[PDB]
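Morning!

As promised:
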Amino acid sequence: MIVPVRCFSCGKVVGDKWESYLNLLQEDELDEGTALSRLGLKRYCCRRMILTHVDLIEKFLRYNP
Amino acid sequence: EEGPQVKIREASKDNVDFILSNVDLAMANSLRRVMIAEIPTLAIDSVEVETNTTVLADEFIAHRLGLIPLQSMDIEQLEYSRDCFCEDHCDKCSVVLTLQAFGESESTTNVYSKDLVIVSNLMGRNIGHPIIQDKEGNGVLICKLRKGQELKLTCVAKKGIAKEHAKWGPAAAIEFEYDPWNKLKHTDYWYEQDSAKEWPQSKNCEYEDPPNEGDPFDYKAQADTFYMNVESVGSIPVDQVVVRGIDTLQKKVASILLALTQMDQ
Amino acid sequence: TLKYICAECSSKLSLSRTDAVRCCGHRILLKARTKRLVQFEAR
Amino acid sequence: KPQRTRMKHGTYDKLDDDGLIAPGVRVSGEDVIIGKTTPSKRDASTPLRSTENGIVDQVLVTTNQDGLKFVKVRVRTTKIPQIGDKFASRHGQKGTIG
Amino acid sequence: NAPDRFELFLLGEGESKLKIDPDTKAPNAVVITFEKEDHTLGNLIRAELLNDRKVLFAAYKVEHPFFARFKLRIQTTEGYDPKDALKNACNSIINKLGALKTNFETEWNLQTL
Ligand SMILES: [Zn+2]
Ligand SMILES: [Zn+2]
Ligand SMILES: [Zn+2]
């Protein structure tokens, strides 16, 4: 639904990285590999967490109530 | 101080990259395990949901709260709730935090670990403060709110260890390596043509002599030098993760001595 | 408050067995959360 | 909510007087989820599925195109991966957690 | 049907930390059941026992991953009590970790953050 707090495999805090990663993509106009390295996500376990996250919360929020 | 030698190569507020030497593999390992598994830490262990009107389930959120790392610098001063003589939780063994958020904009409202508010009495122990590490002082994104949506909640942070639940682990990963050159022949390299070519040399090949080909296999040599790097999740300063790593292990072994002692008496 | 939220129009409401099941005039009604207050283990 | 004037084993304790539990209430086992009576009184209520539990999520009250007051109770549970749960890659081999 | 997860580290009731049984098939051997412990103490304490020369046997095992307990078997040369070897292996360990903590703390203060 939203950014998981920690990387499943090692527990790095990752839930604080999502807004910046969006920003790195759109306004610094960077690619995803470089984006994630700039966020210090070296271990590919951590990379997977943000790279494959799907932010469905953004759709749920469009419901009326 | 003859015994286990420590060096150090990087050190920062999040990682300490060190070389252990003059130790048997077991000990390097038990310390590795402990740091992952047994260092006491503070973390939300109970949520009371007053109103949730978000698009998430209460337990979905509750799950996330427990994963927010809390300041755990002074945790030995906090009691294990299960040992505390109080009825359930109190200031001697728990920290109580509040979350109130309302979305009062057409724009979409974010809820972060910075919005948690200590409401219990901290007795001036440095403990409980949610850990913040990003440039804008937000910490973790807990939730997101549409206009008119609401979230009111009370959590109790309690002392625990990784063994009980991974939200208590102070440590992220622990890089561990010895014998980068395979002198000891502890591994056996799979190959198509040449193992030398197909296998990349690790960082640590720089810090050790490559074996000279005109040489008998060294059959007495042992794993005694270890290339470690400990990464702290923030809830304790790294230097501590290692330090307290060593400590908890001491307390553990000593505790076995007190049991032998106790079966004379 | 009382008993039922409303599917749309969000109106807090309560009736029994007067009236019949309506609002808006929408005929879908939701029970409000208990005041009972639920505890979660955050595990 | 009926009270013995042939009911079911699990308690009726959790229902409000209109006959329905309410979102937030934690149910389990055999608890009466829906309280229904037939005229003193023969009991026709809906127990919760024996092997389950969770929290009540939404309760909806409404009517069919003619007459019937009817009712739908959604119940939420979280399910943590656990010995014996099934998992598969996208290549047609499942396995369970040993 | 899962047990509480605190049972990996929390003793009892009815349970004590150590059971010592006097083996059977070998002179001077002992079998210690450690409760609420795993490979962290097991491999450690054993490895150290094995640097004792008056120790002719040291070995541990976790019989099943579900329960947290290990069995540890020490046999020693005559006139040397295995319970004392365990003692010595422990003390020997308590030190080496002290030594290490201190050394680490030393190297830490040298650092520029
Ligand atoms: Zn990771
Ligand atoms: Zn207390
Ligand atoms: Zn309405």
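Residues A 7, 9-10, 12, 43, 45-46 surround zinc ion (ligand 1) (CB under 6 Å).

Hope this helps with the figure draft.
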